[PDB]
Amino acid sequence: GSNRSLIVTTLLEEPFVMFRKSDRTLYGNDRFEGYCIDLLKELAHILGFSYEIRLVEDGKYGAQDDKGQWNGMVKELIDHKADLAVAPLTITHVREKAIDFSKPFMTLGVSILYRKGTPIDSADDLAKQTKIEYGAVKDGATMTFFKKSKISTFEKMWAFMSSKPSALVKNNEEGIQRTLTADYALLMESTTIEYITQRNCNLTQIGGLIDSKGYGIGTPMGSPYRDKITIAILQLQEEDKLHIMKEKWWRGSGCP
Ligand SMILES: C[C@H](C[C@H](N)C(=O)[O-])C(=O)O
Ligand SMILES: [Cl-]
Ligand SMILES: [Zn+2]
Ligand SMILES: [Zn+2]
**Technique that determined the structure:** X-ray
DSSP state of 58: T
User: Is 20 annotated as contributing to ligand binding?
Assistant: no
How many angstroms is it from 241 CA to the middle of ligand 1?
Answer: 24
What's the fold here for domain 1-108+213-256?
D-Maltodextrin-Binding Protein; domain 2 (3.40.190)
Point out the ligand 1 atom lying closest to the alpha carbon of residue 136: 11
Q: Check if the beta carbon of residue 110 is closer than 8 Å to that of residue 145.
A: yes
Cα–Cα distances (Å) from 127 to 52, 131, 205, 206, 249, in that order, read 44, 11, 17, 14, 33
User: Is 142 annotated as contributing to ligand binding?
Assistant: yes
Question: Which letter, b or e, does each residue of 116-155 get, where b requires 16 or more Cβ atoms within 10 Å of its Cβ?
Answer: eeeebeebebbbeeeebbbbbbbbbbbbbbbbebeeebbe
Q: How many residues does the chain have?
A: 256
HSE-CB at 124 with a 13 A cutoff on CA atoms is: 3
Q: Which of 145, 169, 189 to mutate to test the pocket of ligand 1 (most atoms within 8 A of CB)?
A: 189
Point out the ligand 1 atom lying closest to the alpha carbon of residue 145: 10
User: Is 90 annotated as contributing to ligand binding?
Assistant: yes
Q: Check if the beta carbon of residue 74 is closer than 8 Å to that of residue 98.
A: yes
Q: Whose CA is nearest to atom 2 of ligand 1?
A: 140
How many angstroms is it from 246 CA to the middle of ligand 4?
Answer: 9
Q: What is the 3-state secondary structure (H, E, C) of 127-182?
A: HHCCCCEEEEECCCHHHHHHHHCCCHHHHHHHHHHHHCCCCEECCHHHHHHHHHHC
Instruction: Please list the residues that pair with 72 across neighbouring strands.
Output: none
Domain range summary for the chain, segments of one domain joined by + = 1-108+213-256, 109-212
Q: Check if the beta carbon of residue 53 is closer than 8 Å to that of residue 32.
A: yes
Are 1-108+213-256 and 109-212 equal in CATH topology?
yes
Work out the number of other CB atoms within 10 angstroms of the CB of residue 221: 14
Resolution (A): 1.8
Q: With respect to CATH, is domain 109-212 assigned 3.40.190.10?
A: yes
Q: Check if the beta carbon of residue 17 is closer than 8 Å to that of residue 36.
A: yes
How many angstroms is it from 17 CA to the middle of ligand 4?
Answer: 21
SS3 percent helix, strand, coil of the chain, rounded to 5, is 40, 20, 40
Q: How far apart, in whole angstroms, are the C-alpha atoms of residue 250 and residue 192?
A: 9
